[PDB]
Design a protein around this ligand. Structure first.
Ligand SMILES: CC(C)(C)OC(=O)Nc1cccn([C@H](CC2CC2)C(=O)N[C@@H](C[C@@H]2CCNC2=O)[C@H](O)C(=O)NCc2ccccc2)c1=O
Ligand SMILES: CC(C)(C)OC(=O)Nc1cccn([C@H](CC2CC2)C(=O)N[C@@H](C[C@@H]2CCNC2=O)[C@H](O)C(=O)NCc2ccccc2)c1=O
Ligand SMILES: [Cl-]
Lengths: 306, 306
């Protein structure tokens, strides 16, 4: 037993990280088969980032202006193209460590592991949620651009995130691996509103089921509620409305614990109205929303990869 | 910016995990050079674990009774020995993925990454502290025994922990890689007291410095205190006494922030007496003690490995 914010084992991704340098700027790239993916802002100076014309900036660059290093190994660039906000550098060597992989665009409220990298070198791994407002609350310093987010399914790495920027509010924005930003963000150093964030209700409920499974039961009450009554409460506390799709995804946790989803909603309701009264749930003094229902099942059933 | 509970990249350790089976029991082993390390309780039945005579149980086992599998690869066992609570299985093949490594016995309050494994297969990575009472609050299910804790320094993996058991209170106990338990625990299914745990004061102070560096400053007050006055407060709230060695380790964080360690102690004092008044620090509603001073420096300076 016990419950931890667990990241995927990072080894398959570690083998794909490289350093990419263009003029003055170095950041991380992702080397899969004979393509290296990195943020297109690798071609910008600090001045350019204020208001970049990426098409005009990229026209000045040739293959030989992209320095790509895998460890101490220099890769030869034989092609470059821009796809949305990412650069694809064709190289003359397929990465021998290329894992089975897919590119996925994740939904808001879904979770993934970030491998924070500097100069092509892995420094740390952590688990986070795509916020409803399409930001992430990460840990990123200079040089971390090009760091990637991912999920693993047995032997398949599903890349979902590439780090592009820190907003002036200190939260993080980036793209899928086709270079499409999550949310309204652009790769420009300008004020950008992220808009109202909300709590991921289905995740909080999943984590309450995890708590019950681990013997943290104090918040279970004598009450039930309705989807509509609960959503009146969710609206007031800036929680995502719960839908029947959410109820359906929680079904297996309901089944094991014998706690009807709407009964757990009444427990959540009472926590939102009353607070935690100085107590904790799975060692947290707030309601945790960075576990999906799928996360809780995996952890509570100890599912592995390779 | 931002601050996350980050684990080490796990790839170097993933390459060392194997499955070990003896009679009915399978768990994880650690394959370094031509030795596989695993918990000696691999030789026990459920009945044996009640009151094992490990010397008498091991005498019944021969090399060929230890089934060791690295992926789909069967390793040949040419030697076995018991060292304290671990078994060392000599195998006829050196692990080609053996990273540079050391065996270390860590101090209470030090942190490390756990790679949770089942049947020799990595499932997840998370960061935790060795509690002052020599337990860890992990996430471990059946089959996770032999999972290891570690730190990385550039290219060197320092193994510090091997998972042996869950106490009836739901916390976790294990050994260094020489098989010596952390704390008073034995590898027997019997009631075992862990004794009073305490909060790791130097870690909480390190995390308050991390908060200030990230712009979370609300808890900074107009007060200072003395080491003795602060330790009167630490005693009352079951915090570890702060020593001048702790003050010295915090020096670099003091220097950058301009906040004298004893001023930060007065902030901590006020938080312990007054509580958080429904506010958060780096997205936590309680005082976090699973970051060392060394952790905060690494993260706040973005230090990498290979
Ligand atoms: C003085 C303190 C507060 C300690 O640091 C900064 O102001 N740092 C930065 C200010 C402005 C830009 N950056 C870098 C680019 C370096 C100036 C040349 C930057 O934005 N780097 C990161 C991503 C950011 C940094 C903090 N958190 C993040 O996620 C990224 O790796 C990158 O390469 N961005 C492209 C880029 C290139 C030039 C100018 C801006 C951005 C900084 O690190
Ligand atoms: C019914 C529920 C509550 C869901 O599960 C259990 O009671 N589980 C277990 C009860 C008793 C023992 N174990 C295993 C051993 C299996 C029975 C054969 C066990 O202790 N396994 C783990 C470590 C534990 C399990 C939970 N958290 C941990 O850290 C370990 O991998 C191992 O191999 N231990 C050696 C061992 C061998 C035989 C009997 C006890 C222990 C269990 O998993
Ligand atoms: Cl909390």
């Amino acid at each position: 037993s016990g419950f931890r914010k667990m990241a995927f084992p990072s080894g398959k991704v570690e083998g794909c990280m490289v350093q990419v340098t263009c003029g003055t700027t170095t950041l991380n790239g992702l080397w899969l088969d004979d393509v290296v993916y990195c943020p297109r802002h690798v071609i910008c100076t600090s001045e350019d980032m204020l208001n970049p014309n990426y098409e005009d900036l990229l026209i000045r660059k040739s293959n030989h202006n992209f320095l790509v290093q895998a460890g101490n190994v220099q890769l030869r660039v034989i092609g470059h193209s821009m796809q949305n906000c990412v650069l694809k550098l064709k190289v003359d060597t397929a990465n021998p460590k290329t894992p089975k992989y897919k590119f996925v665009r994740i939904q808001p409220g879904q979770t993934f592991s970030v491998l924070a990298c500097y100069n092509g070198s892995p420094s740390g791994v952590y688990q986070c949620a795509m916020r409803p407002n399409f930001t992430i609350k990460g840990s990123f310093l200079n040089g971390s651009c090009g760091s990637v987010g991912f999920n693993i399914d047995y032997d398949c790495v599903s890349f979902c995130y590439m780090h592009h920027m820190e907003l002036p509010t200190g939260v993080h924005a980036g793209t899928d691996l086709e270079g499409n930003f999550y949310g309204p963000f652009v790769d420009r150093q300008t004020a950008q509103a992220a808009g109202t964030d909300t709590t991921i209700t289905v995740n909080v409920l999943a984590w309450l089921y995890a708590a019950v499974i681990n013997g943290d039961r104090w918040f279970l009450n004598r009450f039930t509620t309705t989807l509509n009554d609960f959503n009146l409460v969710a609206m007031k506390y800036n929680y995502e409305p719960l839908t029947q799709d959410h109820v359906d995804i929680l079904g297996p946790l309901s089944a094991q614990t014998g706690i009807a989803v709407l009964d757990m909603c009444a427990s959540l309701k009472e926590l939102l109205q009353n607070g935690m009264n100085g107590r904790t749930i799975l060692g947290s003094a707030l309601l945790e929303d960075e576990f999906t229902p799928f996360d809780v099942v995996r952890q509570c059933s100890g599912v592995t990869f390779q």
